[PDB]
Symmetry: D2
Subunit: 380 residues, 4 copies
């Protein structure tokens, strides 16, 4: 992996093998098809069982529930390699691991845990997280118009932009009565999932609109410990962690491609790579990558030692994704005409990162998170 300040020297042998392993895998199995799957706008479902065979699904979870029980650094490292190929592939794992497996493990009943975690871990049953609604996801609580009225519940509302919306059997829905979380099977009557069309970003992924019309759900399917905005938020903190890592991976990809191109093309007689203005762009790309890996690494250790805070996560997601988005654009610029075609990746990552830059908290909401943490004043 790209590593200027040798942070690998700080990884365990276990962490570095999952990295080596994730790369050989994705390099054999996904990378040769990424262009075509993005172009056609389709998510490669024959890869879910493979991710699963490699332990990409809920990696840090306990083997008891079918988890790989590896470190957070390792989870971050698989996200890194996944995103290095395409953010859509990384999105699937994030959702399944931190937005589905995670809440069940953290807030589910022992019944829910034994029942779902193993099938989710083995890519045998796919899930999706429904928090964002049409009035706007930056206000998670304020725009949550999905209701839940109670030994069975009846759900009514809508969710927008839900990843795995049409692939999932299980949908973690968040509604109000007070915020609660339900494990809603997608085939229970009154539940409809419709895919979003005309997507110019994160095409290698399924995004749906969820419509719950008088959907019936037993109390045995409501997350017992799931209480308040804090429950789904903790789920975003988890997801955001992997993303701060993946962002660095897509950055390696556009960077690597940019210097190769810069080095093979020439201009007023030197090589593109010899010009000061192109060198400055690459220098910036390298500097950002190095800064990003350290944030991600540091956050991985704090996470396992139980001292990681959401604001800390907000910082790394905000910074890393912003850098990756900027780097993707700079790379497309460097590629010139050749960069407007899916022949190079730079623009695929550039578009994909526009989404990553938006979901799991926009650049601005994270700014506010940090802002409030710094001043103690709420400016949202």
């Amino acid at each position: 992996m790209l590593d200027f300040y040798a942070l690998e020297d700080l990884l365990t042998p276990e962490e570095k093998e999952v990295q080596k392993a994730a790369r050989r895998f994705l390099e054999k199995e996904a990378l040769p098809h990424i262009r075509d799957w993005w172009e056609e706008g389709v998510f490669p479902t024959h890869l879910i069982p493979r991710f699963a065979e490699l332990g990409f699904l809920g990696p840090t979870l306990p083997p008891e529930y079918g988890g790989a029980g590896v470190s957070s650094a390792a989870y971050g490292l698989i996200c890194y390699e996944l995103e290095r190929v395409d953010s859509g592939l990384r999105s699937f794992v994030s959702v399944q691991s931190s937005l589905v497996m995670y809440p069940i493990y953290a807030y589910g009943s022992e019944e829910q845990k034994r029942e779902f975690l193993p099938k989710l871990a083995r890519g045998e049953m796919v899930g999706c997280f429904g928090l964002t609604e049409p009035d706007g996801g930056s206000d998670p609580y304020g725009n949550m118009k999905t209701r839940a009225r109670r030994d069975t519940w009846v759900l009514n509302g809508t969710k927008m932009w839900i990843t795995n919306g049409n692939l999932a059997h299980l949908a973690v829905i968040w509604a109000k009565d007070e915020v609660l979380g339900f494990l809603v099977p997608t085939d229970t009557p009154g539940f409809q999932a419709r895919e979003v069309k005309r997507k110019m970003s994160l095409r290698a992924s399924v995004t749906s609109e969820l419509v719950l019309e008088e959907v019936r759900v037993p109390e045995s399917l409501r997350l017992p410990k799931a209480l308040g905005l804090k429950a789904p938020l903790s789920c975003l903190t988890q997801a955001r962690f992997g993303i701060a890592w993946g962002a660095m991976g897509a950055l390696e990809a556009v960077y690597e491609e940019a210097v190769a191109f810069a080095k093979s093309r020439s201009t007023f007689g030197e090589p593109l790579a010899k010009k000061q203005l192109v060198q400055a762009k690459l220098a910036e790309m390298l500097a950002w990558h190095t800064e990003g890996l350290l944030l991600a690494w540091r956050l991985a250790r704090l996470k396992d030692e139980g001292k990681l805070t959401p604001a800390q996560v907000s910082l790394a997601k905000r910074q890393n994704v912003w850098k990756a988005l900027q780097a993707a654009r700079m790379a497309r610029d460097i590629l010139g005409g050749s960069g407007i075609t899916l022949e190079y990746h730079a623009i695929r990552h550039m578009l994909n990162l526009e989404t990553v830059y938006t979901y799991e908290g926009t650049h601005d909401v994270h700014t506010l998170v940090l802002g409030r943490e710094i001043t103690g004043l709420n400016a949202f």
Copy 2:
């Protein structure tokens, strides 16, 4: 049109009505479809006769040759309205007008002028401009390996990323023997035009690769006055002029849509338009637009009074396109998830502007143009 500094007060009545009519035509005949066409990646050929009828083709040229004989400001103004819909539509007019109609008029023989200009002006025969080659369009003299050997000339070479490549009957090809310019019919044996596929930018336009294999061209088809790099460059200067204008139009498009969206959406209880962080973005968008129109307007007057220099044009193209590209990205950011779909224009303009940001001299070449201007030293 968007006009914060009331520059319309500075336009003649004639110029102001080419603006009103252009928007009426495009608005009922092109904007309703631009989505679909960009989406399926097709250029609406049936609109070429409509542009011809409106006098969009080579607007400043003398009525003698079938031109509308209107002002540069008027040309800039039609480019403005064209780009505001889609850069691809503006590209066609730029090519036909400044990269084709212009070369023939400034460097053609009286025979070539009487023969082609009227057909081109009436959108009866479409042309293209072949300057850029596979090794790098930023050094157009240095990477020009297309050769021409002499009462007939045999041309051999390749051109990459040529607009109207597959629509053109006439191809203005630049080769060396010393730079010369030929009016090469596209059906003369040995001439092949293949379209570029997998385009994520400027999809509502045809881009081709030209391959000239032992193409014979009579001396009667070589541009007599066309001598040196200066000939094709003067064409770019003309083209760059209209682009500085169109850039401002696509800016009005994304800006207008952004404030509308900002005003209609809400979170933490006030409109998105009331937040300090989105008002700053809209404010930047407005500032840039005002700055851009003034540059464009100033250049239009200098142009008609014969005092416009290439360096001045480079400044306007560089500044305006950069600003429009930055504004398109800011708008997509403002639209959130809704901006990643072609349901909003923001991202279509965002992608298109990536191309405009590249062709007709990249951001960096213009910087060097200005740099050389300022210091007298060549740093390319």
Copy 3:
């Protein structure tokens, strides 16, 4: 003057002569000493009678009043040349002309007007404008704790950072009872003016604090028409107009000194001026200079025709000062070690611009002004 888009072509002969004369005067009489004056932190009072002679004091006001009765462009042009030497010299003229002369003229009694305007205009009785208070000048209405209770009015309050505080005989104090405008002689008992020391910025200018303790002022000394926040505010709009002009005077000053240094000094064998990264800083200081003059010029014409709006003024002050400050910083960067010494102006302007970047509305308040104007929503 520096004029890459030949805007001097848009100037009348009179407006062009006031500019030539202004530069000749300042070059011979102020530039040679600005370094020592800014150093010892003193404002050259002997220059006040000279400004008067040249007609710098209240230039647009009617000759009946001792005014030069020239255009707004001309006022903008003298500001330009003044700032090109030092912001402190321009500040004196803005205060005297737009913050003192103006309100008396716009809202004064006929007695106040015939009395005060000619003396102020021959540089015979120098004024100041006391609006800002210790709690925050961005909320001029909110933070206005100075009281006025009534045929005489007793005033109590404090004013911070008042230019000409210790030079003024007349002090335009703004207070509440609804905002009223006064015109307090500085010698009327209970009125104290203390200079601010340890100033790093705008050292060639006197800044004071005004303490009004039970100050008695006849109603004959109150601005009859000065009603509401709108009155002291319109005075800021006038001043901000010449500031937008002056900013592009100091930018000509830093840009010019830097291209000269860049062409004169040199590294790995070429000159500084020839490296891509120095060329780029200069291109940017040229691009902004051009954008700024057009904004300033356009505003000057709208002003004389009664079409100028405050939001319009907010835009050019905001853009031009930010550009001139970034340009000053970029220039100090270009000068290297040599730029940290007053031997080069770059840093003196860099420090001064910091103040103009703050007074007469900070960068952010102007952003909010534009924001409210665009959305119709107040976000201050």
Copy 4:
């Protein structure tokens, strides 16, 4: 320690203590006077023996030579606290430790090491590093016009901007015959050092001009192992290490002061600290500080394990100093009028950092360092 990511957790008890101690003593002996010393532009020589007593002089050097033999992290930590007060105080320690102590230790004879290192360590004899010359410090090999002829050697040439130049007994002079290094006593006939006046940056520090006119130096005073450009460069790498740390310190200082001010001042009825635009600036400052500590930390560990490269150091110096300069400006902006006076530190740090941003390799030379390292091509 401002420490958002709890990096103090990565520090040994010893390192932690050198930090606590450093802050306690500079807090009592330096902070209360810094404002004044900077003002009158004087370096507090009386603090030199104090620094020595705390072990600030050549902290990582072996106790055998009078060194504290502590870690690089610890050296970085003292630099941090020193700069947090003022860059000029940190500069003295950098010069003495990495630009004077270091070269003697790394390239000196056993006689030079035993003779000088203990007196330097005890602040009993102050040194200065003379590399930069009047034609340009960025090309130190190319602009090194100082010559040394041959056992005495006679030196003649001139050096610019040399910190401690007037405070020193020994001057390390780099000259050509190839690059050689000499330990020139400052009282040897033919050597003169006059100060640089009119400094508006790093005023709490002595900067001199060194003039060597036919200066005689024995071969016993030439650094034996000192060969080539590399020798003096290794010295800068060392110095740049501590600076990447110090930068973080001044950042904490302006940041801390900014939020305090933002919290205590209010506007349209909120505190400044509750505005989205001011929160964003602080958020950025906090993000930069967190990124900067990690870079500094990692570099410290790599350094002690003998794995640190110059390019890695270039990255950290360029990034951290640039961020600290940016943050200082963003703080002055936040302070408003109150920020232009030495009452607030913000502007003193802003001015000091302009120097740090320039010496020990400018922002641009570091960019080129990284550039060359990434592409393998030299663009200087």
